[PDB]
Design a protein around this nucleic acid. Structure first.
Ligand SMILES: [Zn+2]
Ligand SMILES: [Zn+2]
Ligand SMILES: [Zn+2]
Lengths: 107, 148
RNA sequence: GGACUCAGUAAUAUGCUUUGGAAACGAAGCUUACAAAAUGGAGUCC
């Protein structure tokens, strides 16, 4: 319990500018605004989609955002179910698995 | 009240019992026709209160339930909404984990849709529908879905 | 096999906090994804 490390993210430089990570703390509109900006900027980066990632507590809200873009903004979205390995210490580093979602929003 | 596909529905979001039934009886058919094809659909709705161990057990039974003699492809439909999607994901992901270890292959299809609960408020309560099979090609009409 | 209880920061659904201005209207920010509910969470009722 003493501390919990974040997830390993094997991302390239081009992925870093195309991927958003949703926190439990993230407010709804803050996330909307951020995704919008990524949609416009993804043209320059040369990718079809903006990847939106969320896990645990954030899952519902992450998907609620995917519902907004798919319906109210007529975007074509793919939805993936994910398992994420996370390291904890309770002393010794122990592995722990949490379930999440990859949500690709196409331009 | 609650709205699906722009249409008002007699639902109480707080009731998983009520909402899961609506999903099964209305939403899932609205996406997949089992009548014209060679598929055998097993339904599995999930709430936040569901035990993971018991639910993975059930999915193992459901995936090996259709008759081997009639040449039917075994398809399980795992579905949930809103605050219950988290537990679904856990059950789903662990089930696949215990499936690929035998050097077997699972195939899945995911669809995301929503309820609209209602100056006028308009909140999206998400809906996750997952199809799982040991057959790579499913005869179901699930074009809107996502292959995984 | 059915029906449920348990996590108080999405505390704020184009909002919100801080900030400038008398006001008009501005500024900054609210991503590096989790809730001992994934050693296959913990319990109750029929
Ligand atoms: Zn670390
Ligand atoms: Zn860069
Ligand atoms: Zn750059």
């Amino acid at each position: 319990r003493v501390t919990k490390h974040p997830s390993l993210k094997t991302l390239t430089h081009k992925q870093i500018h195309t991927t958003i990570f949703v926190k439990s703390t993230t407010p709804y509109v803050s996330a909307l605004k951020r995704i919008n900006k990524f949609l416009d900027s993804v043209h320059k980066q040369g990718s079809s989609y903006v990847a939106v990632l969320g896990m645990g507590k954030a899952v519902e809200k992450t998907l609620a955002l995917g519902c907004h873009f798919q319906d109210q903004k007529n975007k074509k979205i793919e939805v993936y179910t994910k398992t994420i390995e996370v390291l904890d210490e309770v002393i010794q580093l122990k592995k722990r698995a949490v379930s999440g979602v990859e949500l690709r929003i196409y331009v | 009240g609650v709205y699906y596909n722009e249409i008002s529905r007699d639902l109480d979001i707080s009731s998983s019992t009520q909402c899961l039934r609506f999903l099964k009886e209305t939403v899932i058919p609205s996406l997949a026709n089992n009548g014209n094809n060679s598929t055998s659909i097993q339904y599995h709705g999930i709430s936040k209160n569901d035990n993971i161990k018991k639910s993975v057990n059930k999915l193992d039974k459901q995936i090996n339930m259709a008759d081997r003699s009639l040449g039917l492809q075994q398809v399980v439909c795992i579905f949930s909404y809103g605050p219950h999607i988290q537990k679904m994901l856990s059950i789903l992901e662990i089930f696949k984990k215990g499936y690929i270890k035998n050097n077997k292959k699972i195939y899945q299809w995911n669809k995301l849709t929503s309820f609209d609960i209602k100056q006028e408020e308009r909140l999206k309560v998400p809906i996750l529908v997952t199809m799982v099979s040991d057959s790579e090609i499913i005869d179901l009409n699930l074009h809107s879905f996502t292959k995984q």
